Amino acid sequence: DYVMATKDGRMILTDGKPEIDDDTGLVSYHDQQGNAMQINRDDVSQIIER
Numbered sequence: 001d002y003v004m005a006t007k008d009g010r011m012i013l014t015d016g017k018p019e020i021d022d023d024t025g026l027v028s029y030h031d032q033q034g035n036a037m038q039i040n041r042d043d044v045s046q047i048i049e050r
Contacts, residue, residue: 001016001047001048002014002015002016003016003047004016004018004029004044004046004047005045005046006039006043006044006045007040007042007044007045008043009045012029012031013031013032014029014030014032015029015030015032015034016029016030018030018047020041025040025041025042026038026039026041027039027040027041027043027044
């Protein structure tokens with residue numbers, strides 16, 4: 001999906017389609033600006049039924 005609901009409950013509009021580095025727990029997502037940034041796995045709340 002294209003929305004990342006996070007720990008704080010805030011819905012982040014994403015390009016979607018995130019890549020998680022499962023060796024540490026960093027989630028590489030794409031923001032609206034087309035930015036590939038990494039957030040915390042624990043900060044990832046609701047993406048979709050995984």
